[PDB]
């Protein structure tokens, strides 16, 4: 209905959306792995298990 | 200190007072700025030569370099000011207040 | 001005600041100040008009005098002890010269007269740069030489800065001058706690920088440089004026907003030494800054001023350039107090 | 990618797109003269984009959908009621004049943006440099106050200094009795009330201020009524002009970059139209402003950004 | 029957160059809308020289 | 006690996610449910407090205040929705958000175990109130009122903060339990005198103390109805609660220090009661009555006896309920006639009989008719003052007279006489207004039925 | 124009009884208004008021008043039977108190 | 006499009057570099004398 | 006054020394981390509001990225803060242990032996 192009089209910018979602999932995976390694390392240093 | 050290510091004080007290011209204040730079160069050179700090012998030269920049900067501004008013009077730099 | 040239000048300003911040030699710190000033002068004159030229001239004169006094202090210190390292400043006269020169560079009272004039004479972007980035280097040097400071001189200048900032800002209808006076008062607050704890100085500087960035970005978003210009914004973008009001509330120092965190901590620190009277006076004086922030909030957000007819056309268009860091800056400037203990990561 | 400093740093430069037919053209003339037909013919022969004269609803045609909006939410002025009651006590005359100046400024920005983005020429009917004559005709007839003229002069001073004047100014000269006869034959019942003094004031304003001062920026092509129908002759006269006297040849690439950043971002264009000068003719109280703004925000495609209004058929919003 | 909102008279308090005007500052003017002052007609006379007859 | 705090933070998105025509219903229903939940805090012990965690605790002094706050929220919701009908949906949600934030801050304030957290919340209560007053007030003086409301508070509370941190550098803790158990006497020195003043003057300005009360008529007259209700009902009691908490560290310096505040409070209750006799504005009369009652509470806290503390608690709760009811009563007439002049509308008992009955009950409870808890608190305070010095019965006695006068004066000016002839738009009372009055008044008599629940920890 | 600006005239107040003769004064929508009245009356009077008063009235004795009464009765009985004084002026045994050595 | 005049005169009105007067004093500068650079000279001399000489 | 900058063994720009690995890491359900995620959500909402988009529904990927970034930064911020407080406690205890003359544990007296002045309230 717009009289102009309205560069943002009906479909989203799939490249940017994919990049955003990929960055989020990569960050979450890295955080989970880092927390696991931190817990194991602390348990090793203090000799709990 | 000897008499030379106090003489150089007195010259620096005189140049600082001369800059801080404006009369009419911006060029006179720029000249006072260069006078302060010259006094600083002389004092630093005397201190470095007296104590035989070999690697510090290059510091005054570096000082001079940046002095030139300051001078050039000031002159640039002066030109623009004159182009606005036809004079280099500091009385015309009063569009902004506190 | 070319975009490439503008980028190069901004990078040179930043590089001068980092050269001051990473150096161990007094000559290199002075060189960083020199390079920063040389690159900063054209940034103030980016949009050419007589007012910008006058502001640049005043800024240059002030900073050149301050740099010359800085060099004199360094030379005297070298004379009385052949030391070039930035350290406990073995001579008291050189230390007084250094304190006065750095105060002139920072805009601390009574070397404050240039700040409102320069801020008023330049654009909002240059004012943002001057009031945020140009504080880092002198404050870093002051933090480094804090052990040999004379508490009387800096405490006098800090109290004068707070008083003069409040009183001067009380009289302003121009937004840039209001920002300049707020900057003077916050400079006083940051320098008051320097002889006691540099971590508090860093925390206060960070919070002030965040708040100032958010304020200036909101002032750029709605093209207002006066009170009456800002009084039209509600008829175009009400969310902007609402966020502006909450930001002004935070800058006023009211709990539970983040602007309360620095002063609070600073007061606490000053009571760990004896120092009871000075924090009380500082808070009572900061009430003035709160007052003129509240007056601005009255004018822009809490009441609706009359508008013009042509505003209707502005309803049909949108903001093209969008600042990406504005929402994060607003959130950090308002909702950060519960994370106060994280300041331990600063030391 | 959106034009900006990055687009200018690498690649994009304006001066290469100018191909000797950039040639901003404006065709001026009094009321009811055939300047629109001449403009359309000039644009057709020279292959330039024609811009119909900016009216009350020009801004509506360029945003959202091209359909005009209600006069209450757009313009808040009437030309017909200006003809009926030129001395209305609600300040309709100066409100209409100010809105028309703002619309002309927006149209000039659009034309300049098109020219600088594509290199294709543009033809306009009237411009911000020509609007003032009508204002003068309002002032000499006592239709508006002197403070209205002062406010108009302030807005014009702060706005028109940021753009370039047209390359060639075409004028069509028609005698006042002939204008009156054309209006009589037209049949519109409102234009019948235009006194000969108003048209005479417009003609004096034109021939004494507009053409003499626009002749210094560039040469002016004046044509009588009879020699305006031969459009091919006018076009061939246009093709043989030596344009090396105005500011246009002295424009290098950086000033073009600045102008291109200014012409887009229409909020920057319209910034100084709403300066906080409180004239009763154009000042609106807080209550009416609030009501009209709330009414505007309820239009079918206006509450959100152009691509985010799901009530006009916008899809995949939650991934934009 | 409706909430009070500021009018032109109220809004004009904030339109001057300063709050709390005094006899000294009542003659100050607010800056131009764009920060561009009108260009001064600073007459820069050209040097007049006699070339000849000697 | 997160079981009460979390439901309010859930009230927030429920309001912001509600349909445009269902905000009031949802807010009222869930506020009432939260009040019902908070009713469980009344089961208190006889020796120590209910220590929920390291951060929150409930005492016998704070539980009735929490219940009063959670009960007041639905009343303000009901009162506000009449004059906000023409307001847009977003602004209505913003108003409800301000009210919810105020209630959350008050709830967290009344249960903080540390004094600094109490300070932070007791100061955070300022922002929503100021926004409400300066945005949704009706006249032009509201802006000025806001300023008077703000700085008057901050000038009193900024020194307190300093004192607070100083104390933590000396004793090592601000936890109220550790402060109570490790209490030490205060010596008679200038430093201790100024520490006392710093600790006391913030709460004094909050009550407010006579001579420091000029902000209150402005703020309570210029604010909207919900703002007035919350200002008079709960926000004044913060000063009393804080003073009763902080007096544990000020002994024995208190006996010497209190004298000027005691004389100010007694002569000021006399003066404010006298001021109420000549007032052309109906809201200002209620404001000055609030000042008089709070002066009585100041005397009660200052003389520092168990009976005085019970009287202070009972009087605070009773005054909160009564003042909220009176402000709502005045607002009904104001909404009818769009004016606050007291002699403009007369003889309203002829046109609105049940509204006149509500007026009568509110005026009766204002003058402390027995056996209402108003009279219980007043009599306990008077007995404690008599034990303190037998001459006080003079001043208190005079107050007991003047109060009644102005109270009945108000009634006689508004309800009796003959109606104004030219006022022909007095519509019949709505169900909403009558229900608001009933929900104000019934808890008062129910509390009279069981008075030990509002008598504080000294019981 | 002899005027200062363009403003809307001050509107007259709307009477809720004009469109709804039984309006309850809650909302202009009759169904929404009726349900607002219903929820306010049910959750204010029926739920919070009466049930809350019943809950508070039967609150179990944690203030330990009956316990204190029974303990007092036991102590009074024992002291009266054994001939001891009912109450002692010292709540702490003097054997555990060490007064200062010198009072001069 | 008391509530509307003197209690107003002492606490809030005196404060407002003093703050307004000091604001007018502080912010009334013509913007001439000559004057406040002279002030800078005075400040430097005073600081060298009062604080620097007492160490 | 800088307390910890000159502490021996400090690496200039480490932000997390190896010794900090000896401490328990903050739990992923730490309420401070939840508050940081709440801050990220608020930033996303304000970003939607400023750009004139549906505040709650405009960009789910953008809001997710905001929340994730805030949580990711907050985790390491909390780690460093806990490390700093542990260092402070360790240094305090070591200094107290190594200077017994400055921290004497004097005799403890029962309340039956201390004379406290009594100030009657009347
Ligand atoms: C003592 C009697 C015992 C009775 C036992 C049962 C009583 C149940 C009462 C329930 C609560 C009362 C209702 C209050 C809200 C008003 C309701 C209403 O809208 O009425 C319209 C309703 C319908 O009529 P209408 O045609 O619409 O008329 C409307 C017109 O406007 C025309 O309206 P109107 O002109 O009829 O106005 C209403 C009327 C009445 O309305 C009211 O004023 C109600 C408020 C009374 C005074 C409140 C201030 C004092 C606070 C005292 C607190 C006591 C709390 C006790 C526990 C109560 C728990 C709820 O006004 C008066 O008559 C003047 C009242 C003067 C009261 C003086 C009492 C002094 C203390 C008495 C002793 C109390 C302790 C006894 C034990 C002592 C030791 C042995 O009329 C009624 O229902 C009758 C009104 C009730 C009168 C009862 C007065 C005595 C009871 C006091 C409270 C209950 C105490 C129960 C224990 C025993 C005491
Ligand atoms: C302490 C405890 C926790 C609380 C934390 C603190 C509070 C919350 C955090 C604050 C930030 C949150 C929201 C930020 C973005 C708001 C921006 C906005 O405009 O909102 C409009 C937006 C509505 O816009 P729309 O839907 O696009 O269409 C309407 C048009 O936009 C129509 O819009 P318009 O532009 O045409 O209307 C113009 C209007 C628009 O102007 C505004 O809307 C003002 C908004 C300013 C945001 C606040 C500034 C930055 C944050 C600082 C907060 C300070 C808190 C400290 C206390 C001091 C109080 C100031 O401006 C005016 O009318 C001027 C009126 C003057 C009033 C001045 C008062 C403003 C300050 C009030 C701040 C109160 C706190 C925020 C409350 C939430 C507000 C939405 O509101 C929302 O829908 C979002 C709010 C709710 C989202 C969260 C719900 C999550 C999902 C529900 C499920 C819950 C999950 C539970 C978990 C367990 C599973 C069961
Ligand atoms: C409209 C027409 C009206 C007139 C007609 C009315 C008809 C009659 C109705 C009136 C009833 C008369 C009352 C007479 C007294 C009977 C009730 C009394 O006996 O119960 C008391 C009990 O009353 C309750 O304790 C008091 C009610 C609690 C009030 C709480 C208010 C509800 C919360 C709402 C929010 C509050 C906000 C304010 C914050 C503080 C006794 O207390 P208690 O000695 O123990 O009981 C001993 C036995 N127990 C302990 C085993 C139970
Ligand atoms: C108002 C909110 C303020 C927030 C400020 C901006 C937040 C985002 C900025 C991100 C910081 C990037 C740093 C991470 C990269 C690693 C760099 C690291 O090596 O730096 C170390 C140090 O790490 C940083 O200093 C920590 C920065 C953390 C800032 C957050 C603290 C804010 C206080 C609490 C407010 C709540 C925060 C909420 C976060 C969203 C170097 O230590 P050191 O060289 O030896 O110290 C130099 C200074 N000395 C010597 C004088 C002491
Ligand atoms: C040593 C320094 C001490 C600092 C004390 C801080 C005081 C905090 C309040 C500051 C208020 C300043 C107000 C002012 O100066 O302006 C005068 C102002 C002019 O109005 P404007 O809004 O500025 O202009 C609009 C029209 N042109 O006059 C007014 O009307 C002010 C009205 C509101 C102010 C009310 C303040 C009430 C505060 C009372 C208690 C505060 C006492 C503070 C000190 C406590 C004692 C230790
Ligand atoms: C709207 C009205 C609100 C305004 C009321 C504000 C006034 C509040 C009262 C003054 C508070 C100032 C005290 C600040 C905190 C003191 C804490 C403390 O204990 O410090 C003392 C020191 O006490 C002080 O330093 C206080 C000095 C006062 C300085 C500030 C003066 C403020 C105005 C004083 C007069 C005001 C009187 C009350 C207000 C009257 C109403 C107008 C001990 O410190 P040491 O140095 O270690 O002593 C032991 C070893 N020598
Ligand atoms: N700036 C203006 N002020 C007043 N009237 C204007 C203005 N611009 C255009 N008009 C009106 O537009 C009407 C027709 O415009 P015109 O261009 O002369 O005819 P045409 O559409 O045939 O080219 C005229 O009645 C004229 O008055």
D285–E7: do the CB atoms touch at under 8 Å? yes
I119 assigned to some structural domain: no
* Helix H or strand E segment including C307: strand C307-308
For C127, counting Cβ atoms within 10 Å of its Cβ (0-12 exposed, 13-18 middle, 19+ buried), the class is buried
Partner residue facing D317 (CB), from I51, I57, I61:
I57
Alpha-carbon gap, residue D278 to B57, rounded angstroms = 67
> Are β-strands D49-51 and D25-29 bridged in parallel, bridged antiparallel, or unpaired?
unpaired
Alpha-carbon gap, residue D318 to D86, rounded angstroms = 52
- Using the Cβ of F24 and the Cβ atoms of chain G, whether some distance falls under 8 Å is answered with yes
H23–C117: do the CB atoms touch at under 8 Å? no
Take residue F291 and report the two structure tokens written for it: 């000042």
Closest CA to F126 of C294, D177, C79, D179: C294
Question: Residue D119: CB within 6 Å of ligand 7?
Answer: no
G100–I115: do the CB atoms touch at under 8 Å? yes
> Are β-strands F50-51 and F57-58 bridged in parallel, bridged antiparallel, or unpaired?
antiparallel
Q: How far is residue C33 from each of residues C28, C69, D129, F53, I43, measured CA to CA in Å?
A: 9, 12, 49, 54, 36
Cβ atoms I53, I63 nearer than 8 A: no
Q: Which residues line ligand 4 (CB under 6 A)?
A: C 203, 206-207, 210, 258, 332, 336, 339-340, 342-343, 345-347; I 5, 12-13, 15
F214–H7: do the CB atoms touch at under 8 Å? yes
Q: Indicate the domain borders of chain B.
A: 3-92
| E contact test, residue of F87, F138, F145 with most E CBs within 10 A | F138
Experimental determination technique: cryo-EM
CA distance I12 to chain D (A): 37
Phi, psi of A28 (to 5 degrees): -65, -45
Alpha-carbon gap, residue I53 to I57, rounded angstroms = 8
Question: Residue D100: CB within 6 Å of ligand 7?
Answer: yes
Sequence-distant (6+) residues with CB within 8 A of I71 are A31, I33, I36, I37, I40
At G48, is the secondary structure helix, strand, or coil?
helix
Sign of the dihedral through C-alpha C216, C222, C226, C232: negative
Using a threshold of 3 CB pairs under 8 A, tell whether chains G and H touch.
no
Given resolution (angstroms):
2.7
Take residue C170 and report the two structure tokens written for it: 């009380």
* Long-range contacts, stretch E24-33, CB < 8 angstroms, 24+ apart: E24/H28, E25/H28, E28/B97, E30/C173, E30/C226, E31/C51, E31/C120, E31/C174, E32/D158, E33/D154, E33/D158, E33/D272, E33/D275
Alpha-carbon gap, residue D61 to D246, rounded angstroms = 32
For B67, counting Cβ atoms within 10 Å of its Cβ (0-12 exposed, 13-18 middle, 19+ buried), the class is buried
Beta strands in E1-54 (DSSP E): none
Alpha-carbon gap, residue A20 to C5, rounded angstroms = 33
I45 assigned to some structural domain: yes
CA distance B96 to chain C (A): 5
Structural domain of I49:
1-99
Chain D contact set for C309 (CB, 8 A): 76-77, 95, 98-99, 282-284
CA distance C232 to chain B (A): 25
* Helix H or strand E segment including F146: helix F142-171
| E contact test, residue of B89, B94, B97 with most E CBs within 10 A | B97
Per-residue b or e along C225-247, where b marks 16 or more CB atoms closer than 10 Å to that residue's CB = bbbbbbbbbbbbbbebbbbbbbb
Q: What is the DSSP string of chain B?
A: --HHHHHHHHHHHHHHHHHHS--SBHHHHHHHHHHHHHHHHHHHHHHHHHHT-SGGGGHHHHHHHHHHHHHHHHHHHHHHHHHHHSS-BGGG--S---
I48 assigned to some structural domain: yes
- Distance from the CA of D216 to the center of ligand 1, in angstroms? 95
Alpha-carbon gap, residue C143 to C146, rounded angstroms = 5
F435–G44: do the CB atoms touch at under 8 Å? yes
Cβ atoms F76, F432 nearer than 8 A: no
Alpha-carbon gap, residue I12 to I30, rounded angstroms = 29
Q: What is the DSSP string of chain D?
A: ---SHHHHHSS--STTT--S----EEEEE-TTSTHHHHHHHHHHHHT-EEEPPP-TTHHHHTSSSSS---TTTTT---HHHHHH-TT-TT-HHHHHHHHHHHHHHHHHHHHHHHHHHH---EEES--TTTTHHHHHHHHHTTSS-HHHHHHHHHHHHHHGGGSPPPSEEEEEE--HHHHHHHHHHH--TTGGG--HHHHHHHHHHIIIIIHHHHHHHS-EEEEESGGGS-HHHHHHHHTT----SSSGGG--HHHHHHHHHHHSSHHHHHGGGG-S---TTTEE-HHHHHHHHHHHHTSTTTSS-TT--GGGS---TTB-
- Using the Cβ of E49 and the Cβ atoms of chain B, whether some distance falls under 8 Å is answered with no
Alpha-carbon gap, residue D168 to D121, rounded angstroms = 12
Closest CA to C217 of C128, C118, C294: C128
Sequence-distant (6+) residues with CB within 8 A of C191 are C103, C106, C108, C142, C154, C157, C158, C161, C201
Q: Which residues of D are annotated as a binding site for GTP?
A: 32-36, 83, 97, 104, 126, 131, 134, 138, 186, 191
Phi, psi of D144 (to 5 degrees): -135, 165
Chain-centroid distance, C-alpha D291: 29
Cβ atoms D318, I61 nearer than 8 A: no
At F287, is the secondary structure helix, strand, or coil?
helix
Hey, which CATH number is domain B3-92, 1.10.10.60, 1.10.287.3510, 3.40.50.300, 3.40.190.120? 1.10.287.3510
Closest CA to C142 of C158, C125, C165, C124: C158
Q: How far is residue F87 from each of residues D18, F25, F26, F93, F163, measured CA to CA in Å?
A: 55, 17, 18, 10, 44
Give the CA count within 13 Å in the CB-facing half-sphere of F401: 8
- Distance from the CA of C324 to the center of ligand 4, in angstroms? 21
Alpha-carbon gap, residue F122 to F108, rounded angstroms = 9
Alpha-carbon gap, residue F102 to G95, rounded angstroms = 56
Phi, psi of D168 (to 5 degrees): -130, 135
I83 assigned to some structural domain: yes
Using a threshold of 3 CB pairs under 8 A, tell whether chains B and I touch.
no
- Distance from the CA of F283 to the center of ligand 1, in angstroms? 26
Chain E contact set for H28 (CB, 8 A): 22, 24-25
Q: How far is residue C292 from each of residues C173, F12, H18, H27, I51, measured CA to CA in Å?
A: 10, 31, 15, 14, 29
The residue of chain F with its CA nearest to that of G53 is F446
Instruction: Please report the number of interchain residue pairs, chain B to chain E, with beta-carbon separation below 8 angstroms.
Output: 9
Breaks (C-N over 2.5 A) in chain D follow: none
C170–E8: do the CB atoms touch at under 8 Å? no
Using a threshold of 3 CB pairs under 8 A, tell whether chains B and E touch.
yes
Closest CA to F203 of F320, F119, F329: F119
Alpha-carbon gap, residue I115 to F456, rounded angstroms = 32
Alpha-carbon gap, residue F276 to F410, rounded angstroms = 9
Alpha-carbon gap, residue C169 to D74, rounded angstroms = 39
Alpha-carbon gap, residue D36 to D237, rounded angstroms = 18
Chains adjacent to B (≥3 CB pairs closer than 8 angstroms) = C, E, H
E3–F138: do the CB atoms touch at under 8 Å? yes
Gap between the terminal Cα atoms of chain G: 99
Question: Residue G58: CB within 6 Å of ligand 3?
Answer: yes
Torsion angle of the four alpha carbons D113, D118, D123, D125, in this order, in degrees rounded to the nearest 10: -20
Q: Which of F151, F167, F170, F197 to mutate to test the pocket of ligand 6 (most atoms within 8 A of CB)?
A: F197
Which ligand 2 atom sits closest to the C-alpha of C330? 50
Sequence-distant (6+) residues with CB within 8 A of D272 are D155, D158, D159, E33, E34
Chain A contact set for D65 (CB, 8 A): 1-3
- Give the largest Cα separation in chain G, rounded: 105
Closest CA to G29 of G16, G11, G40: G16
CA distance A25 to chain I (A): 9
Chain-centroid distance, C-alpha D30: 16
């Amino acid at each position: 209905k717009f009289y102009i192009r309205e560069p943002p089209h009906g479909s989203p910018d799939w490249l940017k959306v994919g990049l955003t979602l990929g960055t989020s999932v990569f960050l979450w995976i890295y955080l989970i792995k880092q927390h696991k390694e931190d817990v194991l390392e602390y348990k090793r240093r203090n000799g709990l298990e | 200190m000897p008499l030379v050290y106090m003489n150089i510091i007195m010259a620096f004080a005189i140049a600082l007072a001369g800059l801080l007290m404006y009369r009419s011209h911006l060029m006179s204040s720029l000249l006072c700025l260069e006078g302060m730079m010259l006094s600083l160069f002389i004092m630093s050179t005397l201190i470095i030569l007296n104590t035989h700090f070999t690697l510090a012998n290059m510091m005054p030269i570096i000082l001079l370099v940046f002095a030139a920049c300051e001078a050039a900067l000031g002159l640039s501004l002066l030109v623009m000011v004159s182009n606005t008013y036809g004079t280099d009077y500091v009385q015309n730099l009063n569009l902004l207040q506190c | 001005m070319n975009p490439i040239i503008y980028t190069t000048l901004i990078m040179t300003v930043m590089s001068g600041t980092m050269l001051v911040m990473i150096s161990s030699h007094w000559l290199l710190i002075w060189i960083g100040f020199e390079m920063n000033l040389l690159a900063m002068i054209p940034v103030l004159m980016k949009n050419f008009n007589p007012r910008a030229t006058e502001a640049a001239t005043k800024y240059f004169l002030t900073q050149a005098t301050a740099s010359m006094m800085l060099m004199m202090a360094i030379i005297i210190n070298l004379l009385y002890s052949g030391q070039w390292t930035i350290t406990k400043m073995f001579n008291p006269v050189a230390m007084t010269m250094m304190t006065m020169a750095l105060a002139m560079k920072l805009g601390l009272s009574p070397f404050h007269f240039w700040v409102p004039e320069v801020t008023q004479g330049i654009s909002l972007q240059a004012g943002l740069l001057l009031l945020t980035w140009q504080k880092l280097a002198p404050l870093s040097v002051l933090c480094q030489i804090s052990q040999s400071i004379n508490p009387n001189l800096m405490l006098t200048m800090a109290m004068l800065s707070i008083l003069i900032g409040g009183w001067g800002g009380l009289n302003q209808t121009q937004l840039r001058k209001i920002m300049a006076y707020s900057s003077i008062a916050h400079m006083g607050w940051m320098t008051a706690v320097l002889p006691y704890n540099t971590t508090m100085t860093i925390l206060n500087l960070l919070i002030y920088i965040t708040m100032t960035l958010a304020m200036f970005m909101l002032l750029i978003h709605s093209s207002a440089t006066t009170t009456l210009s800002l009084s039209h914004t509600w008829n175009k973008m009400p969310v902007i004026t609402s966020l502006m009001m909450v930001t002004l509330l935070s800058m006023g120092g009211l709990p539970p907003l983040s602007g309360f965190m620095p002063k609070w901590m600073i007061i606490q620190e000053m009571t760990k030494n004896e120092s009871i009277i000075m924090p009380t006076l500082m808070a009572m004086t900061a009430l003035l800054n709160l007052y003129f922030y509240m007056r601005l909030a009255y004018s822009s957000s809490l009441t609706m001023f009359p508008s013009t007819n042509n505003m209707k056309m502005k309803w049909q268009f949108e903001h093209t350039k969008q600042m990406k860091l504005l929402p994060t800056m607003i959130v950090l400037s308002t909702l950060v107090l519960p994370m106060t203990p994280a300041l331990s990561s600063l030391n | 990618l959106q034009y900006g400093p990055l687009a200018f740093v690498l690649g994009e430069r304006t001066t290469r797109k100018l191909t000797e037919t950039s040639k901003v053209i404006t065709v001026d003339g009094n009321i009811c003269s055939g300047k629109g037909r001449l403009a359309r013919e000039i644009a057709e022969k020279l292959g330039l984009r024609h811009f119909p004269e900016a009216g009350i609803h020009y801004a509506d045609s360029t945003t959202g959908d091209g359909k005009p909006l209600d006069v209450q939410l757009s313009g808040n002025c009437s030309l017909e009621k200006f003809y009926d009651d030129p001395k209305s006590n609600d300040g309709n005359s100066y409100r209409l004049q100010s809105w028309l100046y703002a619309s002309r400024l927006l149209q000039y920005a659009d034309a300049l943006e098109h020219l600088l983005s594509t290199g294709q020429g543009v033809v306009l009917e009237r411009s911000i440099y020509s609007d003032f004559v009508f204002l003068e005709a309002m002032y000499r007839q006592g239709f508006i106050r002197k403070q209205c003229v002062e406010h108009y002069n302030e807005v014009k001073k702060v706005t028109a200094c940021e753009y370039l004047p047209p390359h060639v100014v075409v004028y069509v000269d028609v005698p006042v009795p002939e204008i009156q006869s054309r209006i009589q034959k037209k049949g519109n019942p409102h234009e019948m009330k235009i006194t000969a003094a108003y048209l005479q004031d417009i003609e004096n304003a034109y021939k004494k201020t507009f053409l003499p001062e626009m002749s210094e920026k560039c040469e002016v092509l004046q044509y009588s009524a009879r020699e305006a129908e031969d459009a091919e002759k006018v076009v061939e006269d246009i093709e043989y002009l030596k344009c090396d006297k105005g500011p246009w040849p002295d424009q290098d690439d950086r000033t073009f970059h600045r102008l291109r950043m200014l012409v887009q971002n229409k909020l920057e264009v319209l910034n100084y139209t709403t300066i906080p000068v409180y004239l009763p003719e154009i000042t609106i109280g807080a209550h009416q402003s609030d009501r009209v703004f709330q009414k505007f925000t309820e239009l079918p495609g206006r509450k959100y950004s152009p691509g985010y209004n799901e009530d006009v058929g916008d899809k995949w919003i939650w991934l934009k | 029957a409706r909430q009070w909102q500021p009018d032109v008279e109220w809004a004009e308090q904030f339109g001057g160059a300063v709050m709390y005007p005094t006899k000294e500052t009542a003659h100050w003017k607010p800056p131009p809308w764009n920060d561009v002052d009108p260009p001064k007609d600073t007459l820069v006379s050209n040097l007049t020289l006699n070339f000849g007859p000697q | 006690m997160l079981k009460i705090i979390i439901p309010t933070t859930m009230l927030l998105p429920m309001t912001w996610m509600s349909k445009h025509n269902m905000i009031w219903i949802n807010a009222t229903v869930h506020s009432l449910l939260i009040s019902l939940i908070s009713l469980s805090l009344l089961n208190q012990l006889g020796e120590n407090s209910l220590n929920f965690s390291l951060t929150f605790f409930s005492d016998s002094l704070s539980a009735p205040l929490l219940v009063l706050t959670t009960w007041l929220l639905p009343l303000m919701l009901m009162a506000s929705q009449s004059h906000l009908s023409k307001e847009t949906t977003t602004r209505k949600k913003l108003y409800i958000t301000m009210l919810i934030l105020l209630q959350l801050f008050l709830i967290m304030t009344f249960t903080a175990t540390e004094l600094i957290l109490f300070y932070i919340l007791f100061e955070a209560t300022l922002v929503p109130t100021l926004i409400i007053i300066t945005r949704w007030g009706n006249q032009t003086e509201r802006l000025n009122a806001g300023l008077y409301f703000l700085f008057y508070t901050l000038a009193g509370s900024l020194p307190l903060l300093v004192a607070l941190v100083y104390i933590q550098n000396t004793t090592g803790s601000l936890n109220f339990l550790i402060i109570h158990y490790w209490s030490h006497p205060l010596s008679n020195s200038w430093s201790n005198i100024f520490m006392w003043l710093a600790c006391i003057m913030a709460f004094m300005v909050k009550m407010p103390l006579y001579g420091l009360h000029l902000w209150l008529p402005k703020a309570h007259v210029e604010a909207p109805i919900a703002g007035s209700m919350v200002l008079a009902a709960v926000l004044l009691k913060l000063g009393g609660y804080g003073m009763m908490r902080i007096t544990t560290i000020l002994n024995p310096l208190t006996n010497y220090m209190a004298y000027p505040f005691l004389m100010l409070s007694m002569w000021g209750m006399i003066m404010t009661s006298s001021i109420c006799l000549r007032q052309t504005d109906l809201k200002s009369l209620i404001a000055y009555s609030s000042v008089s009652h709070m002066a009585l509470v100041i005397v009660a806290i200052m003389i520092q006896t168990p009976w005085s503390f019970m009287g202070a608690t009972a009087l605070m709760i009773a005054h909160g309920l009564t003042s909220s009811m009176l402000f709502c009563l005045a607002n009904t007439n104001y909404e009818r006639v769009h004016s606050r002049t007291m002699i403009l509308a007369r003889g309203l008992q002829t046109l609105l009989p049940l509204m006149a009955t509500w007026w009568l009950v509110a005026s009766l409870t204002n003058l402390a008719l027995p056996p209402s808890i108003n009279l219980i608190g007043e009599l306990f305070i008077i007995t404690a003052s008599f034990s303190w010095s037998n001459i006080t019965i003079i001043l208190m006695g005079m107050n007991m007279m003047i109060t009644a006068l102005y109270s009945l004066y108000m009634l006689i000016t508004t309800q009796r006489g003959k109606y104004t002839h030219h006022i022909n738009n007095i519509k019949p009372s709505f169900t909403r207004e009558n229900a608001l009055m009933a929900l104000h008044i019934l808890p008062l008599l129910l509390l009279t039925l069981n008075p030990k629940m509002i008598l504080g920890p000294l019981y | 124009p002899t005027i200062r600006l363009q403003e809307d005239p001050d509107p007259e107040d709307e009477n809720l009884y004009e469109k709804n003769p039984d309006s309850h004064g809650y909302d202009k929508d009759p169904i929404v208004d009726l349900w607002n009245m219903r929820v306010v009356f049910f959750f204010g009077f029926s739920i919070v008021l009466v049930l809350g008063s019943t809950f508070v009235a039967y609150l179990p004795d944690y203030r330990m008043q009956e316990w204190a009464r029974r303990e007092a009765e036991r102590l009074v009985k024992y002291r009266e039977a054994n001939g001891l004084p009912l109450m002692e002026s010292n709540c702490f045994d003097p054997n555990k108190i060490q007064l200062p050595e010198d009072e001069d | 006499l008391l509530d509307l005049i003197w209690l107003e005169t002492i606490l809030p009105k005196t404060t407002s009057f003093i703050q307004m007067k000091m604001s007018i004093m502080v912010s009334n500068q013509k913007g001439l570099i000559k004057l406040y650079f002279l002030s800078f000279l005075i400040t430097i001399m005073i600081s060298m004398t009062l604080f620097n000489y007492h160490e | 006054m800088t307390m910890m900058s000159g502490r021996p063994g400090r690496v200039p720009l480490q932000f997390l020394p190896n010794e900090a690995r000896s401490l328990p890491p903050p739990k992923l359900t730490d309420p401070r981390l939840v508050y940081m995620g709440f801050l990220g959500y608020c930033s996303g909402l304000i970003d939607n509001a400023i750009r004139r988009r549906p505040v709650v529904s405009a960009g789910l990927h953008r809001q997710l990225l905001y929340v994730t970034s805030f949580v990711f930064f907050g985790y390491y911020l909390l780690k460093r803060q806990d490390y700093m407080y542990a260092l402070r406690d360790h240094d305090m205890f070591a200094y107290v242990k190594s200077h017994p003359e400055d921290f004497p544990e004097k005799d403890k007296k029962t309340y039956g032996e201390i004379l406290e002045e009594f100030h009657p309230v009347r």
